[PDB]
């Protein structure tokens, strides 16, 4: 393929897990993997971590194609099971799991299974988002020591909701409530995901769950990188271009001639749009590398293409090599100049682009 | 349980490719069906039109995944092919080809193939995306009808870059300039896509080339939806609750803490979030349905889940229904309150989306 690409880069995906066990040396590692792998591949980006203790996804669909791609180590199911007939293949396929709502608790107590499940109960401790809350926290946790189908004792976890703004006492508060749940019972905790492993050591505890900086991306909004942490960027959205053709001073481009050029130039089509993932919000201006040589988009971003400004007396030509992001662009850049979130960059790409894995 | 879902409805699907042909009469229909069948489906899509003329992509890729899927129909190539060396395939699957620059010409020109193809000179009328600028267009022109690769009469098309903005003379200069080229040609000649077919029927010509409007979308944006014009809409984005926890006044929801609660109330947790393809962007209020009764999304919107506000007494519960846009939620209705272009909320999703095809 010559369009449309995301390369992974394997060696980065393992330099990353092994440095994020320099940062939480006394914490196992949850490599979170949910939708698709942050858009590097589920399976192949289970299968370049086989060092990771466990794997965390959002839903027990991707446990199960973890499952059946030949992946074995522990899943972490992080939002529980959402139909109590799913216990017996949680059972079966020694998944862990979120307990947070009383259907799943009632579950547990009235199921019968061939084993018995781990479990990590989920306390809300301030995002407010999934968890048992503080004052039924108590009741809650203890009757899940009294299940005999779940494997002792029991886990605790919990999720940070602003661990990115360090000067807020938003994680501080958070911590406190952690702390004085966990108080005198035995079982992991783990609270931390990106943000609380830079920026919290006190969050550590036993698990952390890397997500978003194992695949070399930052956590936080203040325009820092992968590589502020000594993380290195796995993914490349590439593509190429299409077409090289002379564009006159005054003339529009796009859909809505929104750009206007004021000098006579050659525009490069690049064989990319939000037909593949690429965000249609992208202003004019925003840095694409075509031909290691960072242009700017000119023009609305279409379903399948995208213009770029290469100048009067460029001599790229349809064929030549288009980086979206990657080596000389950061994900990170592109979201400042976009305004839209490295999160969603990475993960919200659709099924038309290809998957390159290297090293 | 039933979590990220796209429900596809093969009946309006077919209503709207007659609808279409009510509007456009004269003229034959070019479904598009690039970038996954704008989210619905390629090959789906495709065979549940097997009445279409034939059908448009983006991509060889889309074309050569239409002909391993037992479509058998012209495929138009909108974008013409990235490499000389696919003219033999091209020639071989019957696949119909744009031409726009000088590498594709010179590609016709040489080759040799054991049969002609069928091609469809592009025109630059004013887009300045893709196509022969005007003052290039009759010596380019002439060597496609020198060509014993090309199936003659050579075909002419164009696309409008301002159709839905009836007010600015736009679509009346790329008019001009059609005109003007055609004149004295034979060859079919074709120029409207969505808006060009409903807003413009001196446009309409030979081939009309339907794409949003054929799934029951508005290629407008002016709070205009599918219905506007008797097409129905093919898509709906369904998931389930997966939690309703007590709130309380005065407290945050999501990452940021973007949404404090001015009452207690219960909140509902749906299992949707970007990794499945939903706007991040979505603000707090935008609607949801949640047993078929609209409901605001409250907090920001994460990869996985979405929350809303149900109510103090709200007797929803985890496993109900939840539609985030279809039957009572158009996708346009959700377009104007997110901002967000409907073209890319449809076709923007990810492969984490389930395909669900009724009638
Ligand atoms: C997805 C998620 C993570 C990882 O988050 P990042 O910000 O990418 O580090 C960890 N834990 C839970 C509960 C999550 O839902
Ligand atoms: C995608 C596309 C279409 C369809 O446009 P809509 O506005 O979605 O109908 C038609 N023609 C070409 C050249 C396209 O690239």
Partial sequence: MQAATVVINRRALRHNLQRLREL?????????????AYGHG????????????????????????????????????????????????????????AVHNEEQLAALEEASLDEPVTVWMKLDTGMH????????????????????????????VSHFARAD????????????????????????????ASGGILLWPQSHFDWVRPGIILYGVSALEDRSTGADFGCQPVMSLTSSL??????????????????????????????????????????????????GREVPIVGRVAMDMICVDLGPQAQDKAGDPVILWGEGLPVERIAEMTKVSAYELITRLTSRVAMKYVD
Wanted: net charge positive.
């Fill in 242 to 291: 299409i077409a090289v053709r002379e564009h006159k001073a005054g003339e529009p481009v796009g859909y809505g001639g929104t750009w206007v050029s004021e000098r006579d130039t050659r525009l490069g089509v690049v064989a990319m749009g939000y037909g593949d993932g690429y965000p249609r919000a992208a202003p004019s201006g925003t840095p694409v590398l075509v031909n």
């Fill in 24 to 36: 939480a040396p006394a914490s196992k590692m949850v490599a979170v993997v949910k939708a698709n």
């Fill in 129 to 156: 988002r999934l968890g048992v809350r503080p004052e039924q926290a108590e009741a809650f946790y203890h009757r899940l020591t009294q299940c005999k189908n779940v494997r002792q004792p029991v886990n605790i």
């Fill in 165 to 192: 703004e360090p000067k807020c006492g938003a994680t501080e508060k958070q911590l406190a409530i952690f702390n004085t749940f966990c108080e005198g019972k035995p079982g992991q905790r783990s609270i931390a």
């Fill in 42 to 97: 589920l399976l192949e980006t289970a299968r370049t971590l086989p060092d990771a203790d466990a794997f965390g996804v959002a839903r027990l669909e991707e446990a199960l194609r973890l499952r059946a791609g030949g992946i074995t180590k522990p899943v972490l199911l992080l939002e529980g099971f959402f139909d109590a007939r799913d216990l017996p293949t949680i059972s079966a396929q020694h998944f862990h799991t």
